[PDB]
Design a protein around this ligand. Structure first.
Ligand code: ZN
Ligand code: ZN
Ligand code: ZN
Lengths: 338, 339, 337
C-alpha cells in the first residue's frame, strides 16, 4: 500500500496475514502437520533523485504466528530481504544487502504454487535463494536497445557463520533472459568456494560449489506453463534423517513443471511436478530429495484477499535411504494482504 | 491510524509506546514484580470490501519490550499476540483462522478493564481463556440480523504439541453466547479440549480433558462501568510450586472478578476491583489461593492518543501460601502515547 | 515520513535500509564482512491542548547480515521506546528507553559516516542508549534565555542478568548554550553500581561516574567539534588474553571532528579519537580507542546517500589489553524515509 509520495519519495508499506494449516498423517510427510500461520511486513522505498537516477531500498520481515508467547516466540522469525540500490537510465541498477540469488531469476519460472513448490530455492544456499551480502548489477532490455533481453551479474561475499548449512565463500553468478510475446527462456549460473567449515561436513567433497538452471515459460491469455532444469555441485544441503548427519549433495538433477489457468472470476487451478535427485551421496549413491505431483487451486476474491488449497501427492518411497518424508501434505490457507 | 483507504481496501496501522515502571518491596515475593516495564506494540487491522455483502479482513500485532538491554536478553518478552485472516458475509456470520483471543475470553473481557493489571484468569497460550495459536472461529452477530444484541460464536482449537506443557494443547471445541440491551451485558462461555501426553506426564492434575467456562455481567452506560466474572477450570490453569520448583495444572479453580469504574467527562476514570482465584484439590496441597487482591487505580485520558494511569494492588495473599505466591503489594505508573 | 496527521495527532513512520560492508584483515577495529541492517520506527505526537503536547517514539534494529536459521535474531534490538509530555516553556518529561544525558554532550563528536562516538556505549549508565530513564528537558530556559537548554535525568536500577548491561539508581544532568553558530555543553551523571557489577575482577567502586564537555562550530557548511570526558568505574573493558570482563577505574576521552559540507553533495570528514584507561588492575595505564579517521559521504538527496569510512588504527600490534591493531574501511549505500 503506497502510504507516502510527497517531495519525490515513494514509500510502499506492505504486509500479509496468512492463516495456514498443514494436514498430514501424524513427521514423515512432505511439509508437516499443524498450525502454519505467519505474517509479513516490509517497505519498498524509492526516491527520484533526477529523471535518470533512482535510489531505492527494500526490507521485509517474517513474523511466525504458530509460536507461543513463552520461550519459543521468536522461532522462524527472519529478515528475508534488506538492500539498497541505485538505478540509472538504461545503464541498469546496482544494489547491495540481502536479496534473491541470480540463479533464482531462473528458478522463479516454476515457483508459482499456492503454498509449496520451488523446492530447489534453498535459503542461505549460494545463488538459488535469499543470501546475505550480495552485490547485484542488473540490466533490463540490454541498455534500452533490445526490449525483453534482461541480464544480471552478481558477486557473493563470504559468510563464515558458525554452521556449515548457512555459510558460504566468495563467488560470482549471472543470469540471461529474453522474452517475446509472452514467451520466456532463461539461463543462470554461479560458482563459489565452499567455506572450510562446509568442507569438514561428512556429506559432500569439493573445493567449489556450482549451481545452474534454465527455464521456459508461456504467460499469456490466462495460461501459465513453466519448466525448469538445473544441476548443482556440492551446493544442495542434505541431511540423513536416520543418523541426523548433514552436509551437501555432490550432484543434484532438478526438474520442475507448472501448469496453471487463470479464470476471470478468480479461481486459478494448478498442477505441477517436481523431482530433485541427488547423485554420489557418501555411502548411499543416488537418493531422491524431492519427488511429487501437485494439485491445487487459488481463489482470489480481489487484489487484497485470497484463499487456496495445495495438495502434494508425494512420490518419495517409504524406504528412502536418506529418511525423506514419504507421506502427502495438503495446505489450507486464507491470505489477507495490503 | 487509518494510513490507507483506496480501491475498496482499508488499512489501520496502530501502535503504542508505554512508559511503565513497577514499584514493589525489594520483589520476587510481590504481585507484579519491580523495575522498568516499558514496552511498545505495533500492528495492522486490514479490511477489504470484496462486494456489498462479502468482507475480507486480517489483523497482526507484535510486542517489542523496551525494558531489555542490547545484549543476549534483546528479545526477552517479544511476542506476536495476534495473526489471522477471515471473511464476513452479510448476516450469515464471520470465519477466521490464525492466532486470536479464545472464546472464553469474550466472557472474561467484561472485567478485563483495569488500568494495568486484572483479567488474571485469562492466561496466554491456555486453551480458551486467552491468546492461542491455531483457532478456527465462527462468529454470528445479532443472530443473523434477527435478534439485535444476541451474539454467539463457536471455535475449534487445533492440537499444538509444543516443547513445554504450559504452552501445549490438544484438539478442542468451545463457544460463547452473549446478549446486550441498553448497555447491559450477560455472557456465558465454555470450552473443552484433550490434554497432550506431555501435559498428562506433568505432576499436579490428572485429566483426560481440560475444561474452562465463565459467566459475565456488565453495565456499560452513563459513564458507569460495572462488571462481574465467575468461572471454573478443570486441569486448565497452569500452576507452579516455588519451594518444590515443580509445575503443572490445577485440577479445579474457582475465579471471581468484580470491577467498578466511573468515567468523568474531563478524562479522569477511577477504578476499584476485587479478584480471587482459588485452586481446589491441588495434588499435595489441596486448597490454595493463586490470586487474591483488591485494586485501586485511576486513568487520566488527555485524549484518544495520550493517557497516564496509576494502578495499586492491595495484595490479599498470606506469606505462608503453599505454592509460594507473592504476598507483597505492587503499584504501577504508566504514561502512554498511542495511535 | 509523515504517515498520518488528522485531528491534532501526527505519526511519522521512518526507517532505513543500509547496505554495509566492512573490509579488514580476515583482530581489527570494526570487523570484516557483511554489516547490512534495517531500521524501523515511529515518532507520534498529539497536541492535547494549546500549551501541552503528548508524544511517544519507538525504534527497532533488524539485522540483514544474518541467515534464516538459529542466528536470525543476532543483533535485533529495541533502541528507543518512551512516551512523554511537553508543556509550553516549562519543559518536557518522558520515561522509557532514551538517550543518556551524557550523550547530549557526546553528540557533538558523534558525527562520522559510520564509526565514531566510541565513548557512547549502549546500556552504559548516562553515556549512551539506556533503559528506564525519566528525563525532564527544558529549552531556552522557560523562554527567557534563547539557546540555553538543560536537562536532568533519573536512572532506575536495572537488575539485568550480566554486569555489562546492569545499572543502579542514579541522577545526571546536561547544560548547553549556543550563540551565532557556536555551542558549548557540559554533562555529568553518577549512579550506585550493582553488587554483581562490584564482584567483577576489573574495576572497584561504590558508584559509577561519567562527565563530558564539548564545543563546536556548525555554520557556513563547516563542522568542527571537540569533546573531552572522564569516567570512573563506568566504561566496560575486556582482556582477550585472559577472557576477563570488567570496568575501567578511570578513562580519559578525547574526540575531534572536522567536516565540510560541499553544496553539490559530497561531505568529507576527518576525525581523531583516543580513550585511555588509567590503572586498570593487572595492566595499569592502557588505551581502549586510538585512531585517525578519513571519510566522505555523498548525499544524492534527503532520502539517499553513500559513504566510505576509513579508520587509521593507532593501537599497536602488541597492545596489552588485546584491542585490535588492524585498519577497517566501511562502504555503505543507504536509503532512508
Ligand atoms: Zn527468505
Ligand atoms: Zn497474547
Ligand atoms: Zn542503541
Amino acid at each position: 500500500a503506497e502510504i507516502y509520495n510527497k517531495d519525490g519519495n515513494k514509500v510502499d508499506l506492505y504486509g500479509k496475514a496468512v492463516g495456514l494449516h498443514y494436514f498430514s498423517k501424524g513427521e514423515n510427510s512432505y511439509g508437516g502437520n499443524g498450525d502454519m500461520t505467519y505474517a509479513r511486513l516490509g517497505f519498498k522505498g524509492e526516491t527520484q533523485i533526477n529523471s535518470d537516477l533512482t535510489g531505492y531500498g527494500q526490507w521485509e520481515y517474517n513474523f511466525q504466528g504458530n509460536n507461543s508467547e513463552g520461550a519459543d516466540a521468536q522461532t522462524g522469525n527472519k529478515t528475508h530481504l534488506a538492500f539498497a540500490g541505485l538505478k540509472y537510465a538504461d545503464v541498469g541498477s546496482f544494489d547491495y544487502g540481502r536479496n534473491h540469488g541470480v540463479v533464482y531469476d531462473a528458478l522463479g519460472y516454476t515457483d508459482m504454487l499456492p503454498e509449496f513448490g520451488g523446492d530447489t530455492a534453498y535459503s542461505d544456499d549460494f545463488f538459488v535463494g535469499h543470501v546475505g551480502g550480495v552485490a547485484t548489477y542488473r540490466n533490463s532490455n540490454f541498455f534500452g536497445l533490445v526490449d525483453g533481453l534482461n541480464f544480471a551479474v552478481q558477486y557473493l561475499g563470504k559468510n563464515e557463520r558458525d554452521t556449515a548449512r548457512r555459510s558460504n565463500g566468495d563467488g560470482v553468478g549471472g543470469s540471461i533472459s529474453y522474452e517475446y510475446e509472452g514467451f520466456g527462456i532463461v539461463g543462470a549460473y554461479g560458482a563459489a568456494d565452499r567455506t572450510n567449515l562446509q568442507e569438514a561436513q561428512p556429506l559432500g567433497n569439493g573445493k567449489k560449489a556450482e549451481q545452474w538452471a534454465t527455464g521456459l515459460k508461456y504467460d499469456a491469455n490466462n495460461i501459465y506453463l513453466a519448466a525448469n532444469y538445473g544441476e548443482t555441485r556440492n551446493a544442495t544441503p542434505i541431511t540423513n534423517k536416520f543418523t541426523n548427519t548433514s552436509g551437501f549433495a555432490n550432484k543434484t538433477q532438478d526438474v520442475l513443471l507448472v501448469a496453471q489457468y487463470q479464470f476471470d472470476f478468480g479461481l486459478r487451478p494448478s498442477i505441477a511436478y517436481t523431482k530433485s535427485k541427488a547423485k554420489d551421496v557418501e555411502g548411499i549413491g543416488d537418493v531422491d530429495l524431492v519427488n511429487y505431483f501437485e494439485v491445487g487451486a487459488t481463489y482470489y476474491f480481489n487484489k487484497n484477499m485470497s484463499t487456496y488449497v495445495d495438495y502434494i501427492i508425494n512420490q518419495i518411497d517409504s524406504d528412502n535411504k536418506l529418511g525423506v518424508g514419504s507421506d502427502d501434505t495438503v495446505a489450507v490457507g486464507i491470505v489477507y494482504q495490503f
